[PDB]
Amino acid sequence: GGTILVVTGTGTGVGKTVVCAALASAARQAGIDVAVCKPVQTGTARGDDDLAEVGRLAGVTQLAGLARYPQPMAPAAAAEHAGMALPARDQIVRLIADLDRPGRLTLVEGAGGLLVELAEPGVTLRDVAVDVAAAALVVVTADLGTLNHTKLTLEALAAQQVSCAGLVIGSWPDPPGLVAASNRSALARIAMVRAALPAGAASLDAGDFAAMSAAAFDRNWVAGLV
Amino acid sequence: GGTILVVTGTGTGVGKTVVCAALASAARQAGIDVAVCKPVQTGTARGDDDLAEVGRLAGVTQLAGLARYPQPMAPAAAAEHAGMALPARDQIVRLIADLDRPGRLTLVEGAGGLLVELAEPGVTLRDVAVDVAAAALVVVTADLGTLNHTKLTLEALAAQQVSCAGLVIGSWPDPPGLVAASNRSALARIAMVRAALPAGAASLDAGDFAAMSAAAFDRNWVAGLVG
Ligand SMILES: Nc1ccn([C@@H]2O[C@H](COP(=O)(O)OP(=O)(O)O)[C@@H](O)[C@H]2O)c(=O)n1
Numbered sequence: 001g002g003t004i005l006v007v008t009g010t011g012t013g014v015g016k017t018v019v020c021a022a023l024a025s026a027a028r029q030a031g032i033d034v035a036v037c038k039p040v041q042t043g044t045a046r047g048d049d050d051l052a053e054v055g056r057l058a059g060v061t062q063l064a065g066l067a068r069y070p071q072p073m074a075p076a077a078a079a080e081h082a083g084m085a086l087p088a089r090d091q092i093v094r095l096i097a098d099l100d101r102p103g104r105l106t107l108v109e110g111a112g113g114l115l116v117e118l119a120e121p122g123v124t125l126r127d128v129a130v131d132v133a134a135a136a137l138v139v140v141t142a143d144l145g146t147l148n149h150t151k152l153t154l155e156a157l158a159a160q161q162v163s164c165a166g167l168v169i170g171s172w173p174d175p176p177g178l179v180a181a182s183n184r185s186a187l188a189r190i191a192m193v194r195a196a197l198p199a200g201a202a203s204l205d206a207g208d209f210a211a212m213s214a215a216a217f218d219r220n221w222v223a224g225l226v
Numbered sequence: 227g228g229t230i231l232v233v234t235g236t237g238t239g240v241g242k243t244v245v246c247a248a249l250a251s252a253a254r255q256a257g258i259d260v261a262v263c264k265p266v267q268t269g270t271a272r273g274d275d276d277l278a279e280v281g282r283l284a285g286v287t288q289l290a291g292l293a294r295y296p297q298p299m300a301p302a303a304a305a306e307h308a309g310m311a312l313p314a315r316d317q318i319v320r321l322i323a324d325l326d327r328p329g330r331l332t333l334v335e336g337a338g339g340l341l342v343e344l345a346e347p348g349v350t351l352r353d354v355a356v357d358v359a360a361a362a363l364v365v366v367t368a369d370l371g372t373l374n375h376t377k378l379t380l381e382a383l384a385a386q387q388v389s390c391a392g393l394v395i396g397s398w399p400d401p402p403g404l405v406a407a408s409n410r411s412a413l414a415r416i417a418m419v420r421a422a423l424p425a426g427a428a429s430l431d432a433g434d435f436a437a438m439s440a441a442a443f444d445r446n447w448v449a450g451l452v453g
Pocket residue numbers: 009011012013014015016017018019112139170171172197198199200201202203
């Protein structure tokens with residue numbers, strides 16, 4: 001076995017996907033082999049595709065997925081809209097265990113938040129993390145309300161003994177503002193803030209994104225993940 | 227005593243204050259005596275005042291506050307900015323217990339979400355509900371992400387044996403889109419949906435607000451909140 005992290009967020013559009021790519025890119029430049037798994041992808045009608053973002057931004061090639069639904073809804077609703085079911089629990093857990101190998105960092109990106117339905121029936125990214133014995137990296141905002149949502153996600157993780165590998169602020173504004181600066185300090189009091197990615201990093205070309213990513217995390221911590 | 231209800235939300239700006247006003251209004255129209263309590267109010271230098279707004283909307287006059295901070299931040303950050311302290315846990319409980327009375331519905335409006343720190347050290351509204359043996363009414367959105375946020379809040383309540391008095395969709399769009407209608411159907415499988423308040427209800431005058439409020443809640447449920 002290697003290291004499996006689920007990358008979850010406190011909500012939708014907090015930057016989980018940019019974080020997966022950024023940590024992927026930071027680990028790759030540390031000589032770590034990276035694989036990213038997005039079991040369920042929604043919003044394909046408008047072109048959503050988080051694995052292709054990670055491939056473009058970070059250059060991961062081991063990019064694995066099981067289902068893609070057209071509508072920009074939560075997985076369960078997008079599936080009912082399409083008239084089809086979510087994939088089964090065993091599919092996603094086994095896909096991830098099969099990605100896992102010594103010396104490799106495997107990131108599992110969910111859909112929205114920790115407790116959204118990912119597989120039939122009612123199984124979540126938390127259930128999946130329990131099954132593969134993964135730790136969780138939690139992507140937060142620096143905006144108003146983040147302390148509550150972070151604490152809630154962290155309590156839900158710990159309730160099922162899913163270790164917290166730290167926080168990442170998905171989007172750090174420029175200029176910060178009084179709320180973001182206050183929240184960042186307050187976030188660090190409840191868990192390790194591993195990085196804060198600058199707002200707009202997802203528009204960067206691959207070379208600029210690698211530079212940002214290498215600077216954004218601590219070199220020792222990334223190397224220490226595997 | 228009577229019935230104490232904390233009114234919390236899955237976030238800030240989900241409609242806690244309008245819900246408080248609407249439930250207060252429906253209970254008042256059922257002949258129930260109502261008090262609305264706001265132990266920690268932030269953003270007062272921007273004009274933020276939920277007690278005053280509950281009074282504007284539903285006519286409530288039994289309105290109790292405790293801490294007020296000028297800056298629109300989390301209570302802990304607003305207090306630091308002002309060089310003031312958060313209230314103690316027992317000061318909040320005293321504020322609520324002074325209001326509690328047989329035959330009375332006392333509503334305690336949180337600040338932001340359920341785990342916002344209201345007192346030191348890290349004392350939250352969940353702790354307060356334990357102290358005054360109140361159930362929690364959870365105000366949610368109908369938008370993307372509400373299911374995760376509602377389930378996270380409900381787990382947090384169960385972890386401390388704080389009963390969930392049900393859900394209220396704070397703002398309900400007319401017409402509802404696909405995502406909103408899906409979320410609503412799914413929220414009703416998670417817990418009782420007590421009401422879904424029409425969007426923009428804060429622009430209804432006293433009469434239209436009161437009518438909206440009587441229709442929004444099941445009369446049996448409201449009447450059953452306090453005997
Ligand atoms: N540091 C960041 C984080 C996100 N973003 C963008 O803001 C949107 C939300 O990010 P995301 O797609 O990773 O959100 P999740 O739903 O994956 O959590 C996306 O369109 C990002 O491209 C950015 O430009 N700079």
